């Protein structure tokens, strides 16, 4: 009946137990009241308790970091990450070294967020792209651009059958290109390439503006034939998201982007755990793709942490399964290497892979098509590149 | 700091022959992405506009700050689109922490300010020329309504300006903010009587996104005297709506709840006093609450006094009241005024409620220290004809 959290956390040993205690009882109950008897065994439903105290090290100056386990009883909170939080990691995310490791959250709690409107089968059914990883590409540039401009740029990727195209989520600017004249603009152009490609590859547009006015602006997006709403999730916030993934009338999938969740979850010691801020969070929130620092990129989120946010994203549960869109180092060399950690089930997003080309983005996308043909077929890439000069160019810049 | 752009210095690691090559695509890959219309879109185009070593390391790494300069024009005038800008995707590139965002007048403008302000918040309370104090619920969760006006009397019957909800409180099985209001308002009427004061009110505002503003009108129709909010957890751009919100006409008072998950870190995240200073003001709060130098985790000296300064700085909005949290007893008035002076809200929790004359000798208490410093008295002097104050210099010192 009770969300437990596991905290991670540097301090002396002989203060854990009280450390411990003053968590349990200070952030659900605050405090025992002088009520009468009735009064007080009644409250005692209301109140947190330490679930575990485990010494992971003790250091030579004295110090000990420990893992803490605390149950919040589930009657305390209101159904919004707002609530969840500030209860579990609000003021205590103040006190010093600590980062928030773990979430078992009830089933109770999690019946009352939306999960995602679309999931897996539903962007698949959406675009009509099944049994294949999808492909999606990224406008190299925007802001300073006409719409003109824009329109060609994203020609030129739905030139190569990419199923997605997302405009760069650092498109904030309205000056030369409204979000509802890209909508519109984007699906014509599309139009006249499926008649070459055989796809009407969609736009996943970015979605902006002040919070006031973005459920009705995502509402006339989707109106407006949009694939998908890209979502800078954190900077908005959880509940913001939330109630768009939980409106009808927002009908279209959305694209959780992870722009400044790196401040939360990049420090070992401090924040909270990168699964729990791209994965666990994400999939309650209702993301129906999530994008996350790939463990091919320069940087990684780790083996641990990856390996737990794709199964809080696939997890059986009561909500819908996140496709999960693991970003950098994405390139038609990884193709099979990628099958093998994520299935079919799979965003290949690409930057670099299609810009970077030697070919140009339409080569770019026909690149991962071929080395999709590969896969499937049991070819060897290296071998299948001899009758396809996208996936050959592709070999031969990135191996 | 140029006047068409805002310039943020990032903390990071990287290798020292590699600072400018990371500079430059840092500069160019968040603003236009990449390359006679040249000169029309280099208007969006960032610079990098300093590269300063730190520490040499003998693994070949560097210490360093970068500036990087993001032109005005890029950003759409929300939380989302300066955030995402100066630490979007760049947030996730391994050791590299925001530490200074220097933004000109006409962005600072683009955002709300506080709508009372210090001097605002004084008036609204009628309460000047000294320091203003502020009483936390001890207990929310599992209390009935008519338990809850009980505590919220003790609480007024010290005569405090101000009683604000556990950031914690969330659940309305037993008592609805709403009715919580109604009822703490007819009681601080009652006990105005004998103690001369209408003691305010500030409650949690809670609930989902879609209903807050109709939530925060309602609570200020009901006589709310400020907005408890958690900031952070909801998100900059959510409370920025309510600060512009003419009908949301109550100060609102900020809660650093979440916070401490971006700045906790000396080497990543965001530092305390843009989160907790610099970001609050821009979102409109009238009172920021953060951790003070008295309690066992401090801001440290020097976030301190960068997030006061952004609190305080002459410019575009009005100032915003500190309510410094953590050991705050009778004892430190004298110090509190010292390092404030009258503008603070001394914002204290068990200083109040673990007074051995329980809630209302513990507000008490606060005032006769804050008499005795106006009149230079010493604190122990004070206490001879004293007991509120005699009793927390006993127990607290
Ligand atoms: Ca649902
Ligand atoms: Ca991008
Ligand atoms: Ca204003
Ligand atoms: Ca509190
Ligand atoms: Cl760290």
Redesign the pocket.
């Known amino acids: 009946d009770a969300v437990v959290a596991t905290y991670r956390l540097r301090d002396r040993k002989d203060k854990l137990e009280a450390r411990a205690e003053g968590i349990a009882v200070g952030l659900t109950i605050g405090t025992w009241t002088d009520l009468p008897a009735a009064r007080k065994s009644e409250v005692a439903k209301h109140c947190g308790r330490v679930e575990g105290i485990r010494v992971l090290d003790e250091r030579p100056d004295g110090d000990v970091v420990a893992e803490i386990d605390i149950a919040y009883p589930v009657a305390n909170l209101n159904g919004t990450f707002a609530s969840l939080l500030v209860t579990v990691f609000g003021k205590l995310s103040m006190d010093g070294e600590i980062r928030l490791e773990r979430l078992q959250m009830p089933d109770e709690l999690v019946r009352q967020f939306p999960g995602p409107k679309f999931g897996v089968e539903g962007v698949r059914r959406r675009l009509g792209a099944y049994n294949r990883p999808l492909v999606m590409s ?1 406008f190299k540039a925007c802001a300073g651009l006409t719409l003109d401009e824009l329109v060609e740029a994203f020609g030129e990727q739905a030139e190569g059958g990419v199923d997605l195209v997302k405009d ?3 498109f904030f600017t309205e000056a030369y290109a409204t979000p509802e004249d890209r909508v519109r603009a984007y699906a014509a152009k599309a139009d006249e390439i499926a008649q070459r490609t055989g796809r009407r590859t969609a736009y996943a547009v970015n979605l902006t503006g002040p919070v006031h006015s973005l459920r009705e602006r995502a509402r006339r997006l989707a109106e407006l034939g949009a694939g998908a709403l890209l979502v800078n999730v954190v900077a908005y916030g959880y509940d913001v998201v939330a109630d768009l993934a939980r409106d009808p009338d927002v009908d279209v999938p959305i694209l959780a982007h992870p722009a400044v969740s790196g401040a939360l979850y990049g420090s070992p010691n401090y924040g909270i755990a990168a699964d729990i801020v791209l994965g666990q969070l994400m999939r309650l929130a209702g993301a129906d793709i999530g994008i996350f620092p790939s463990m091919y990129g320069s940087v990684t989120l780790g083996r641990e942490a990856t390996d737990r946010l794709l199964q809080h994203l696939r997890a059986e549960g009561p909500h819908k399964p996140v496709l999960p869109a693991p970003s950098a180092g994405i390139y038609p060399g990884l193709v099979p290497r990628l099958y093998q950690d994520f299935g079919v089930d799979l965003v290949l997003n690409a930057g670099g892979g299609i810009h970077g080309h030697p070919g140009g983005a339409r080569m770019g996308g026909r690149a991962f098509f071929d080395a999709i043909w590969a896969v499937e077929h049991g070819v060897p890439l290296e071998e299948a590149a001899k009758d396809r000069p996208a996936l050959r160019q592709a070999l031969e810049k990135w191996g």
Do not use: V
Request: proline fraction near 0%.
């Open positions: 990224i760069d989520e650092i």
